[PDB]
Amino acid sequence: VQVPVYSEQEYQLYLHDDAWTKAETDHLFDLSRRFDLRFVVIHDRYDHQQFKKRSVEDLKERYYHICAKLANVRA
Ligand SMILES: [Ca+2]
């Protein structure tokens, strides 16, 4: 499986979360592409200058909830 790519419109309409910025979400997806979805590595390399402490499970939940939402809105 590949990392999904969402458009700006898809993010605005369907992917916002009160506790996540689009910048952080884009960072998570960029690291997921660069580090082959190895969440221990993504977690270790996360930008903690800009973004708060997230657990590995928090990163996975964000990534996988976006995957499920995109699957539904693209159907
Ligand atoms: Ca990759």
Curated annotation (Swiss-Prot):
Top-rank lineage group of the source organism: Eukaryota
User: In its UniProt entry, what is this protein called?
Assistant: DNA methyltransferase 1-associated protein 1
Q: Its function?
A: Involved in transcription repression and activation. Its interaction with HDAC2 may provide a mechanism for histone deacetylation in heterochromatin following replication of DNA at late firing origins. Can also repress transcription independently of histone deacetylase activity. May specifically potentiate DAXX-mediated repression of glucocorticoid receptor-dependent transcription. Component of the NuA4 histone acetyltransferase (HAT) complex which is involved in transcriptional activation of select genes principally by acetylation of nucleosomal histones H4 and H2A.
| Subunit composition and interactions | Component of the NuA4 histone acetyltransferase complex which contains the catalytic subunit KAT5/TIP60 and the subunits EP400, TRRAP/PAF400, BRD8/SMAP, EPC1, DMAP1/DNMAP1, RUVBL1/TIP49, RUVBL2, ING3, actin, ACTL6A/BAF53A, MORF4L1/MRG15, MORF4L2/MRGX, MRGBP, YEATS4/GAS41, VPS72/YL1 and MEAF6. Component of a NuA4-related complex which contains EP400, TRRAP/PAF400, SRCAP, BRD8/SMAP, EPC1, DMAP1/DNMAP1, RUVBL1/TIP49, RUVBL2, actin, ACTL6A/BAF53A, VPS72 and YEATS4/GAS41. DMAP1 also forms a complex with DNMT1 and HDAC2.
The disulfides recorded in the entry are none
Q: What range(s) does the SANT domain occupy?
A: 17-67
- The residues of the intact protein that this chain contains are 133 to 207 of 467
Q: Where in the cell is it found?
A: Nucleus; Cytoplasm
